[PDB]
Structures are given as C-alpha cells and as structure tokens.
Design a protein around this ligand. Structure first.
Ligand code: CLA
Ligand code: CLA
Ligand code: CLA
Ligand code: CLA
Ligand code: CLA
Ligand code: CLA
Ligand SMILES: CCCCCCCCCCCCCCCCCC(=O)OC[C@H](CO[C@@H]1O[C@H](CO)[C@H](O)[C@H](O)[C@H]1O)OC(=O)CCCCCCCCCCCCCCCCC
Ligand SMILES: CC(=O)O[C@H]1CC(C)(C)C(=C=C/C(C)=C/C=C/C(C)=C/C=C/C=C(C)/C=C/C=C(C)/C=C/[C@@]23O[C@]2(C)C[C@@H](O)CC3(C)C)[C@](C)(O)C1
Ligand code: KC1
Ligand SMILES: CC1=C(C#C/C(C)=C/C=C/C(C)=C/C=C/C=C(C)/C=C/C=C(C)/C=C/[C@@]23O[C@]2(C)C[C@@H](O)CC3(C)C)C(C)(C)C[C@H](O)C1
Ligand SMILES: CC1=C(C#C/C(C)=C/C=C/C(C)=C/C=C/C=C(C)/C=C/C=C(C)/C=C/[C@@]23O[C@]2(C)C[C@@H](O)CC3(C)C)C(C)(C)C[C@H](O)C1
Lengths: 172, 70, 194, 161, 159
C-alpha cells in the first residue's frame, strides 16, 4: 500500500534517495540511512571509486603473490613489504602523483556534476566501449560493475587481513 | 520556520507528523562559485600569497644556503 | 548538455570555439574563463616555439661542438656553466630585442592584445606562407605547429629531468647497471618520519 | 538462419544440439564469438607452426632480464618464460585490438566488421564478399579444432609436437 | 579492361584469370599497389646496384656511434647495421611520403599522382608512354629485387 520496503533489509523502508539508481530496484540496502543524510550522488561516486580501486587491488595482490613481478632487482620483495620497499624506492610517490592528477580531474567531474553543468551520472566518466546500447543492457552492466566492486572490496579486505595475519601467498 | 533555528540551517522543520521517510542531507549547501569567491578574499588571498612567498624563500635558502654567490 | 570532446565527463569549455586547437576543447581547470584567450594562445605558441628550439639545441649541442674554446658538455645542462659570459650577454640582448620589438613595447599581459588586430602568435616571421593557402590548409599548418610545440615542451621537460635522474648525458639512456634511479636526497616531512 | 553463414560443405546447417531455437540477438552474439574464436585460432596455429618450420629466434626477448627468443620452448611452456611485462604487453595489444572500436550489439563490431580492411573485397563485387567471409569462417573453425588438438598434444606429449 | 599494362608484348596478361569479374575499383587498387611496389622496387634495385659501381660514398653515418658510410655493408646484411635513429628517420620519411596526400579511392593519390612530376609529359600524348614505361620498369624491378633478395639470403654475400 505504501512505504516501498528495502528488498535487502525487509524491516526498513527504502531510502528515497536510492530511487533511480542501479542497486535499489533489487536490493535497496541502506539500513543506516547514509543516503538520507549524505548526497546519494556523492555516495555512489565513492562506492564506485572504491569498487574499481579494490578490483584493481585484488588482482594486483593476486599477481604480486603469484610470482608476477616486474623485471627489476628492487621489485623482488613480497607483497607485505612491497609497500615499504616501493615507498623507499620511489614508485609509490610516482603512482601517487599520477593518481593525484587523475583524482584532481575526478574532483572537477564531481564539482561539475553537482552544479548541473553536466548531465554526468555519478560513476560515469565517458568510457563506453563495452557498454550495451539497450537501456536494460546498460542497467545490467552497471549492476555487474557494482556487484563485482563490492565483492572485490570485501575480497581485498580479507586478502590483506589474512596475509598480514598469516604470511602466505593467497589460497592460504 | 516557527521553531527558532539559526540562519543557514540544514535542519528540517521539527514540526512533522508521523515518522517521515524523507531525505535531509546534512552537508553544507556550498557552491563552487561561492567557494572560489571565498578563497579570493583579501585575508585568504594575501595569506596564501605570504605563505607562497615564505615557502619560496624557504626553498631558496635550502637549496642555496647562505649568500654564497654574493 | 554539451560536454568537452577531449574530456567527456567535463563541460565543454567556452572561449575555445574559434581557435586552431579548439576542436578538441581541452580545458578541465578552465583558464579560458579566467584569462584572455589571446594571451593564453600567445603564451602557448611562444612556449612551444621556445621548447622546439630548446629541444633541437639540447639534442644537437653535444654534437655541433661549441664556440671556439668552450667545451659543449655532453650533458647539455652544464652548457650554461661552460658558456662564455659574452655569449650569455649576446643571447640576452638578442632575446630582449627580438621579444621587445615584436610587440612595439606592448609586451605585457594587460597591454599586449589591447591595440586591435594583434593576432595571437603572429610575429610576422613568414606569415605570408599562410597569407596564401586555403583556410583549412592554413589552420592545419597552425595545428601542426601547436601539436609540435606541445610535444616539444613535454619532451624538453623530459630531457632535462632525465639528465637530472641519470646525472649524465641524454642519449646514453639507462646506463649499464642501472637498477633504478638513486633515491632522492635532501629532507622532507616523510624523511624525518612524518 | 539456415541460409546464413558459410556452410562450405553445403546443406550442412548444423544446430546438432538444437543450440539456436530462433533468436537473432543470441545468434549474432554467437556469430561474433565464433568469428573471433576462428581468427584467434588461425593466428595461434600460425604462431605455433612458425617456431618449428622456420625456427628464427634471433636475439633476446628480454635484453635486460636475459630472456632469449631461442630459450622459450614452443608451445604451452611459453607461459612461464615469456617476460612478465612481455605477457602484459601482448595482453595490452589484444586489448587495443578489441577496444579500439565498438563490438556491442547494434554496431558493426558485433558482426565482426572491423577496421583492418586488409582484403578490401571491393563492394562493386558483393559476391566474392560472401566467399571471402565464408572461407574465413570455415578456416577459423578448422584452425579452431586444430589449435585445441595442438594444445592437447602439447599437454599429453610434454612438448609442442 | 585492357589499358596501361595492355601495352605489354604479351598483352592483357591474365593468368589465374583475376580482374575478370568486373572488379573495376579492385583494378584501380591493384593499379595503386603495382605503381607503389614498382617505385619502391626500382628504388631498392638502384640502391643495390649503385653501392658496387661507385661504391659507398665517403662520409660518416652516426656521430656518437662512430658508424661511417663505409662501415655499413650492402644487401640484407645492412639491415642490422644502420642505427635505431637512422632506421627511424628512414621509416619516418616513408611515413611522410605515404601520409602527405590522400591515397583513398578516387583521389589523385589513388593512381600514383602525388605531384612528383619531374619526368613528366608535355601533354602531347607522351603521358601514356611515360606512365607505361614507369609501370614496366617497376614490374621488372619487382622480380629483380626479389631475386637479389634470394641471392643475398642464400649466398650470404651482397651478390
Ligand atoms: C566505500 C564503501 C562503500 C560506499 C561508500 C557505498 C555506498 C553505497 N552503497 Mg554500498 N556496499 C559496499 C561498500 C560501499 N557502498 C560493500 C563493500 C558492499 C558489499 C556488502 C556493499 C553493498 C551494497 C548493497 C547491497 C547496496 C549498497 C548501496 C549503496 C548506496 C546506498 C547506501 C548508502 O546510503 O551509503 C552507504 C555508505 C557507506 C557504505 C559508507 C561506509 C560506512 C561504514 C561505516 C551507496 C551509494 C545500496 C544501493 O545500491 O543504493 C542504490 C544497496 O542496495 N551497497
Ligand atoms: C589498486 C591497484 C594496484 C596497486 C596499488 C598496485 C601496487 C603495486 N604493484 Mg601492482 N598490479 C595491479 C594493481 C595494483 N598494483 C594489477 C591490476 C596488476 C596486474 C597487471 C599488477 C601487477 C603487478 C606486478 C607484476 C608488479 C606489481 C608491483 C606493484 C608494487 C610497485 C608498483 C608497481 O611497479 O606496479 C606495477 C604495476 C603494473 C605494471 C600493472 C598495473 C596496471 C593496472 C592497470 C593497474 C606496488 C605494491 C611490482 C612490485 O614491486 O611487486 C612487489 C611488480 O613487480 N604489480
Ligand atoms: C635584454 C635586453 C634588452 C634589449 C636589447 C631591449 C631592446 C629594446 N626594448 Mg626592451 N625590455 C627589456 C630588455 C631589453 N630591451 C626588459 C628586460 C624589459 C622589461 C622591463 C623591457 C621592456 C620594454 C618595453 C616596455 C619597451 C621596450 C622597448 C625596447 C626597444 C626600444 C629601445 C630604445 O629605443 O632605447 C634606446 C636606448 C635607451 C638607451 C635607454 C634605455 C634605458 C637605459 C637602461 C638607461 C628596443 C628594441 C620599447 C619598444 O618600444 O618598442 C619598439 C618599449 O616600449 N622594452
Ligand atoms: C615557488 C615555491 C616553491 C618551490 C619551488 C617548491 C619546491 C619544492 N618543495 Mg615546497 N613549499 C612551498 C613552495 C615551493 N616549493 C610552499 C609555499 C610550502 C608551504 C609553506 C611548501 C612546503 C613544502 C614541504 C612541506 C615540502 C616541500 C618540498 C618541495 C620539493 C619537492 C616538491 C614537493 O614536494 O612539492 C611541494 C608541495 C607544494 C609546494 C604544495 C603545497 C600546497 C621541491 C624542491 C618537499 C621536499 O623537500 O621533498 C624532498 C617537502 O617535504 N615544500
Ligand atoms: C594468438 C597469436 C599468437 C600468440 C599468443 C603468440 C605468442 C608468442 N609468440 Mg608468436 N606468432 C604468431 C601468433 C602468436 N604468437 C604468428 C601469427 C606468427 C607468424 C608471423 C608468430 C611468429 C612467432 C615467432 C617467429 C616467434 C614467436 C614467439 C612467440 C612467444 C614470445 C612472444 C613473442 O615474441 O611474440 C611474437 C609474436 C608475434 C610476432 C605475433 C604478432 C609467444 C608465446 C617467439 C618465440 O620464442 O616462440 C616460442 C618467436 O621467436 N611468434
Ligand atoms: C628502398 C630504398 C633504399 C633503402 C632502404 C636504402 C638503404 C640503405 N642504403 Mg641506399 N640507395 C638507394 C635506395 C635505398 N637505400 C638508392 C636509390 C641509391 C642510389 C642513389 C642508394 C645509394 C646508396 C649508397 C651509395 C649507399 C647506400 C647505403 C645504404 C645503407 C645505409 C643507410 C644510408 O646511408 O642510406 C643512404 C642502407 C641500408 C650505404 C651502404 O650501406 O652501402 C651499401 C651507402 O654507402 N645507399
Ligand atoms: C590515499 C593514499 C594515501 C597516500 C599516502 C599519504 C601520502 C604520502 O605519504 O605522501 C608521500 C609523497 C612523497 O613520498 C616520499 O617521496 C619521496 C620522493 O622523494 C621518497 O622517495 C618516498 O617516495 C616518500 O618518502 O608525497 C606526495 O607525493 C604528496 C603529494 C601528492 C600530490 C598528488 C597531486 C598531483 C597533482
Ligand atoms: C639461410 C639461407 O640461405 O636461407 C635464406 C632463404 C631466403 C629466402 C633466400 C632468404 C632471403 C631473402 C629474402 C629477404 C627473401 C624475402 C622474401 C619475401 C619478402 C617474401 C614476401 C612475400 C610476400 C608476399 C608473397 C605477399 C603476397 C600478397 C598477396 C599474395 C596478396 C594476395 C591477395 O589475396 C589477397 C590478399 C586479396 C585478394 O583479393 C587479391 C590477392 C592479390 C590475390 C633468407 C631468409 O634471408 C635466408
Ligand atoms: C613503441 C613502443 C614500444 C616500446 C618502446 C617497447 C619497448 C620494450 N618492449 Mg615492447 N611491445 C610493444 C611496444 C613497445 N615495446 C608492442 C606494441 C608489443 C606487442 C604486444 C610489444 C611486445 C613486447 C614484448 C612481448 C616484450 C616487450 C618488452 C619490451 C622491452 C624490454 C624491456 C627490458 O628489457 O627492460 C622494451 C624496452 C620485452 C621485455 O623484455 O620486457 C621486460 C618483452 O618481453 N615488448
Ligand atoms: C550481499 C552482497 C554481496 C555480497 C557479499 C558478500 C560475500 C559479503 C561477505 C562479507 C564478508 C565476508 C565480511 C567479512 C566478515 C569477516 C570479519 C568481520 C572478520 C572478523 C575476524 C576477526 C575480527 C578476527 C579475529 C582474530 O583476528 C583476531 C582478533 C586475532 C587472531 O589471533 C585470531 C583471529 C584471526 C580469529 C555482493 C554480491 C558482493 C554484492 C551484492 O550487491 C550484495
Ligand atoms: C616558422 C618559420 C620558420 C621556421 C622554423 C623552425 C625553426 C621550425 C622548427 C621546428 C622544430 C624545431 C620542431 C621541433 C620539434 C621537437 C620535438 C617535437 C621534440 C620531440 C622530442 C620527443 C617527442 C621526445 C624525446 C625524448 O627526449 C625524451 C622526452 C626522453 C628521452 O629519454 C627519449 C627521447 C629522446 C625520445 C622558417 C621556415 C625557418 C622561416 C619562416 O619564415 C618562419
């Protein structure tokens, strides 16, 4: 009759800030109501940035702990001490500089989408490529991106936690 | 706004009926034009200029200690 | 609405409409809205020209020797130390005359493009070649100049910093037993355990 | 869809497992998949026969690491010894070949129409076009079975042949 | 379609048929390919014949590398002797010559017309003579250059 409920948390009404977004029509999981207090566009931007970063980080850890190593004597360090040896070596600051450039332009994207100067969607950066033309295909692809991002966030969290606890490669 | 609340308030009016599933973003409604205008203030602009000048002098003193080339 | 062709996730920047390199409309930060586009184009063209001449000099200095007496160092960064004082004074005088007679004294950001028909970057050095041709061809030549200028700016920066990291000449790239650049000296907030 | 494709042996529309019950979208997806698979198989079988017929392993694949063209064994043993970023760059070139233009349904890429244009069938003759594409498809299928059999032979025997 | 190459003493040479299927723009594209291959093959053959009669002309080839014009041998040997920069400049000249004018179908570049002219007709019917002479010389030079390639590959020497 009313108060469209969260399909994930069935005892809490879905936050109206979730309407029109990818993960709302099937999950709608906002129990703490962050979207009620924070701008849902910013939250989606943060979620997708985290998901993409974690999806890169998970495969990076997989490669580094499987023996995939760049051809250099300085690069022959384990993943645990990788982000101390590479910090001292220099490339960590280099990656920081380039990601800082990319993130400054991402800041421009965010501070242009909020004022309406662009019709840019939160996670959108313009990379269509493997993007369906049909709207249903676009929605399903965005849902796949979000689910993979969340899964890899949790996966990388577990990977780093278990690797620090018990120093091993990855299957543990 | 019958309930006395301060100017520039992100608070919904506390005189509401039964529990409302509404979106009340608690973040300042700032503006990019407004932020740029604020950072262009004489105090902000001139303190930034002073910080830039001081840091430039710091770096010149670090990489060229003393007046060796007098 | 309208978005920049180069950066699809940013608005299309204005003031780039009628210009040689404006079809890619790349201006994320947006100095177009803040500054006169004529001055920005003049500065870009001058930087590109200076850096193209600088690139060919940096490459060809250890080759074409030097003034009878001075030893053009293989690493071109020390050529400033190896340069004679008279040569530096002549270079400064020539640059000053060339850059001050080009604008008839209106050589400043407030006064350069204030007269009227000051075409940005048109100092009159062989502008007759563009006086012919056919619009699209002339704009294509100007775009070639702009792209080469940007490429040479980035390239000269890379050459200078390669000579900094290697502490040697430009062409013997990655010397034997390189194993990465030496870690940077001098302290920082992270050097004292920040 | 029995009149689509190549069917070089003629009268050989083969749904066998009744794979296509009739749906243009799924059939076009599988056609793009099959044409891409055939191109990959032909290229891989070439890169598998070439190291044996004309050895031609001159120089080092990795001048810095020391990986020589003549030390990588031909076949499956290649993916431990071809340099790390060597495989990364091969993957990157595949990415360029697959991501330069669009391969989404509703675009020429979904039909295999790409930017290579190294045969240029000359549209004035839209009859050798069908022959060229049919030969491409059939040869891709042949090299498909060929390359999978070659990989199985490599795995079983212990070396390429 | 019996033109240009039809001047041959053999005639409209079509072994293995080909171009019999009204392939008019295929014919034009093959004309472009034949002209370009002929020009490059003639350049190659001349650059193979010249270094023996009036051999490597004196000079120097690589400032830092100490490579001279007399150091680099002839034939397929010379492939791995010109430095990386030298080959880069040669291939860049190739790329500039290729990309200077549009070679797409229908353009003047789609028939070998790039404005080189130099040895050009006075518009007195000798244009066909000049075009056919260039075509025949290129056709001959293609097999000549492949034969010299095979000689260098098998014998090992430049001859
Ligand atoms: C950086 C972490 C992060 C962030 C910012 C978000 C942000 C978001 N998620 Mg999300 N999510 C994440 C990680 C994250 N997620 C992970 C790891 C999982 C796997 C369990 C999920 C699973 C998930 C589901 C199943 C759903 C969301 C949804 C949402 C949206 C509404 C929730 C909200 O108000 O904000 C949440 C704010 C935070 C998580 C901040 C972190 C707080 C901690 C203390 C919002 C865009 C909903 C959606 O699609 O809305 C349209 C939805 O249905 N998320
Ligand atoms: C979140 C993303 C992320 C981050 C922070 C890192 C961080 C790091 N990686 Mg890594 N990596 C990643 C993703 C990531 N990687 C992915 C996706 C791959 C698969 C291609 C790899 C493959 C990889 C190798 C093979 C090596 C590293 C190495 C390293 C370390 C030095 C940096 C370097 O040379 O990277 C190099 C990264 C690349 C060449 C590929 C990155 C390109 C994608 C698009 C990102 C550092 C700990 C090196 C190291 O010292 O390990 C101890 C090393 O040898 N990584
Ligand atoms: C590097 C050396 C150098 C040289 C050779 C020149 C040369 C010239 N400048 Mg110039 N200029 C220079 C540096 C130089 N400038 C610098 C560093 C600045 C920035 C402060 C300027 C700013 C400038 C302006 C704003 C103008 C010139 C102008 C001129 C021209 C007229 C000079 C004249 O008649 O004076 C004759 C001799 C005089 C001796 C005395 C000068 C004062 C001395 C120091 C005492 C002449 C081509 C004018 C140009 O008019 O239009 C053609 C003009 O309006 N210059
Ligand atoms: C034109 C003036 C000028 C110049 C040439 C430099 C140049 C430099 N600074 Mg510096 N700096 C400046 C102004 C300047 N800074 C100002 C105004 C401040 C704040 C008061 C600082 C604070 C600062 C710190 C705290 C550090 C540097 C460092 C450095 C060096 C590494 C680059 C870097 O980290 O960026 C500096 C970053 C900024 C200027 C951005 C500030 C916002 C480099 C030589 C670092 C260093 O020594 O590394 C070895 C370092 O740790 N600078
Ligand atoms: C699916 C396509 C495919 C794949 C994955 C490979 C993969 C490989 N080839 Mg290869 N190759 C291919 C097609 C392919 N080739 C084709 C079509 C030819 C014929 C021109 C060759 C001719 C060839 C030679 C002559 C050599 C390789 C070699 C190699 C290995 C080292 C990497 C290298 O130098 O690449 C080269 C890849 C190309 C030139 C293809 C572009 C690597 C396993 C080297 C090796 O050691 O083999 C074990 C080697 O010397 N390839
Ligand atoms: C397809 C065209 C082609 C190509 C690829 C080359 C390539 C080459 N020539 Mg060459 N050459 C060409 C046409 C060509 N030539 C023509 C048309 C002539 C006649 C003028 C010559 C006359 C010539 C001489 C006289 C010499 C070369 C030499 C060389 C080699 C050193 C590079 C150099 O100095 O160039 C030029 C290099 C392999 C040098 C060499 O290695 O000697 C064999 C050398 O001394 N060339
Ligand atoms: C979020 C990721 C957290 C980043 C870690 C903190 C950053 C940090 O420690 O900075 C540490 C780095 C420098 O880090 C220092 O670098 C030195 C290089 O001389 C050392 O070699 C080591 O890399 C490290 O000590 O600082 C910066 O690079 C900060 C500026 C980043 C600007 C990006 C914007 C580009 C425009
Ligand atoms: C140790 C020792 O002593 O051995 C020696 C051996 C040897 C050989 C002597 C050596 C040498 C010298 C050399 C350099 C030999 C070179 C050989 C070459 C360049 C062969 C290229 C053929 C290209 C072809 C056929 C392109 C063909 C293109 C074709 C057919 C196009 C075909 C079209 O089908 C396409 C593509 C579309 C159709 O619609 C139309 C047509 C035109 C039919 C060595 C290697 O040094 C060592
Ligand atoms: C013009 C751009 C360009 C440059 C400038 C360049 C340069 C180097 N390439 Mg590369 N490359 C391509 C482009 C370029 N490569 C392309 C389009 C491909 C097709 C996929 C490709 C393939 C491979 C493979 C398979 C390997 C490889 C490597 C190296 C290497 C050695 C570094 C070192 O020894 O330190 C250097 C310097 C080999 C390796 O040794 O990596 C350690 C390695 O195995 N490359
Ligand atoms: C639901 C959903 C998804 C999902 C999902 C999934 C898979 C969610 C899974 C989440 C998951 C798996 C969350 C981990 C919890 C583990 C914890 C908290 C570990 C505790 C461990 C602790 C606190 C450590 C304890 C100790 O270390 C101490 C204290 C010292 C040691 O001596 C002893 C040990 C080691 C014991 C998608 C598909 C991804 C997206 C979709 O849209 C929605
Ligand atoms: C305009 C005019 C005239 C003129 C003119 C002139 C002078 C035109 C000049 C044009 C000119 C001089 C254009 C140079 C470009 C240089 C570039 C692009 C540098 C590339 C360098 C690059 C891309 C990178 C190099 C690298 O170094 C890096 C970065 C790292 C190294 O480790 C590796 C290498 C070395 C690869 C006339 C005709 C004389 C008269 C007329 O009347 C008026």
């Amino acid at each position: 009759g009313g108060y469209k409920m969260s399909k994930a948390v069935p005892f809490l009404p879905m936050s109206p800030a979730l309407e029109g977004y990818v993960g709302a029509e099937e999950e709608g999981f906002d129990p703490m109501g962050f979207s009620l207090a924070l701008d849902i566009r910013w939250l989606r931007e943060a979620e997708l940035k985290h998901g993409r970063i974690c999806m890169l980080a998970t495969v990076g850890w997989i490669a580094t702990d499987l023996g995939m190593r760049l051809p250099g004597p300085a690069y022959q360090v384990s993943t645990l001490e990788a982000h101390d040896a590479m910090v001292k070596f220099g490339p960590m600051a280099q990656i920081l500089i380039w990601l800082g450039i990319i993130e400054v332009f991402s800041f421009l994207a965010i501070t242009n989408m909020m004022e309406g100067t662009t019709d840019r969607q939160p996670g959108d950066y313009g990379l269509r490529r493997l993007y369906p033309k049909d709207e249903e295909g676009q929605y399903e692809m965005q849902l796949k991106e979000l689910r993979n991002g969340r899964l890899a966030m949790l996966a990388f969290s577990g990977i780093v936690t278990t690797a620090v606890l018990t120093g091993r490669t990855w299957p543990f | 706004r019958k309930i006395p609340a301060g100017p520039y308030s992100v608070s919904v009016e506390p005189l509401r009926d039964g529990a409302t599933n509404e979106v009340s973003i608690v973040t300042p409604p700032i503006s990019s034009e407004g932020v740029q205008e604020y950072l262009s203030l004489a105090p902000v602009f001139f303190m930034a200029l002073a910080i830039f000048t001081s840091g430039f002098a710091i770096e010149v003193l670090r990489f060229f200690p003393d007046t060796r080339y007098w | 609405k309208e978005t920049s062709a180069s950066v699809p996730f940013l608005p299309k920047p204005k003031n780039l409409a009628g210009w040689v390199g404006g079809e890619t409309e790349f201006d994320p930060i947006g100095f177009s809205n803040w500054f006169d586009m004529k001055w920005l184009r003049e500065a870009e063209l001058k930087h590109g020209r200076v850096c193209m001449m600088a690139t060919v000099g940096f490459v060809l200095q250890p080759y074409i020797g030097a003034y009878p007496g001075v030893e053009m160092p293989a690493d071109s960064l020390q050529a400033v130390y190896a340069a004679p004082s008279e040569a530096w004074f002549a270079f400064i005088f020539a640059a000053g005359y060339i850059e001050s007679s080009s604008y008839n004294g209106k050589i400043t950001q407030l006064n350069m493009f204030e007269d009227s028909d000051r075409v940005p970057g048109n100092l009159g050095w062989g502008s007759t070649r563009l006086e012919g041709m056919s619009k699209e061809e002339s704009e294509l030549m100007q775009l070639k100049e702009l792209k080469n200028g940007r490429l040479a700016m980035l390239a000269f920066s890379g050459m200078v910093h390669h000579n900094i990291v290697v502490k040697g000449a430009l062409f013997p790239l990655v010397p034997d037993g390189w194993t990465g650049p030496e870690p940077w000296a001098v302290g920082s907030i992270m050097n004292n355990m920040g | 869809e029995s009149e689509r494709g190549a069917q070089p042996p003629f009268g050989f529309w083969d749904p066998l497992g009744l794979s296509a019950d009739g749906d243009v979208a799924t059939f076009k997806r599988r056609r793009a998949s099959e044409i891409k698979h055939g191109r990959i198989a032909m290229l891989a079988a070439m890169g598998y026969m070439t190291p044996e017929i004309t050895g031609k392993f001159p120089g080092y694949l990795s001048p810095s690491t020391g990986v020589k063209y003549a030390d990588i064994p031909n076949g499956l043993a290649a993916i431990s010894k071809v340099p790390v970023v060597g495989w990364l760059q091969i993957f990157a070139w595949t990415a360029v070949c697959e991501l330069w233009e669009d391969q989404v349904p509703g675009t020429p890429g979904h039909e295999g129409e790409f930017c290579f244009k190294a045969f240029k069938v000359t549209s004035d003759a839209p009859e050798t076009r069908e022959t060229k594409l049919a030969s491409e498809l059939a040869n891709g299928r042949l090299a498909m079975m060929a390359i999978i059999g070659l990989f199985f032979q490599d795995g079983l025997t212990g070396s390429a042949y | 379609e019996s033109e240009l190459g039809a001047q041959a003493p053999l005639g409209f040479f079509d072994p293995l048929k080909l171009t019999g299927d009204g392939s008019v723009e295929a014919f034009k594209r093959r004309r472009q390919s034949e002209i370009k291959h002929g020009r490059i093959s003639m350049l190659a053959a001349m650059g193979y014949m010249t270094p023996e009669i009036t051999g490597k002309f004196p000079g120097y080839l690589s400032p830092s590398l100490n490579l001279k014009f007399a150091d680099v041998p002839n034939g397929l040997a010379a492939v791995s002797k010109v430095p990386a920069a030298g080959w880069a400049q040669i291939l860049g000249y190739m790329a500039y010559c290729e990309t200077s004018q549009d070679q797409s179908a229908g353009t003047p570049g789609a028939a070998g017309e790039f404005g080189f002219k130099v040895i050009t007709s006075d518009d007195d019917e000798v244009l066909k003579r000049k075009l056919a002479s260039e075509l025949a010389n290129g056709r001959l030079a293609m097999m000549a250059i492949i034969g010299m390639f095979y000689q260098d590959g098998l014998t090992g020497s430049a001859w």
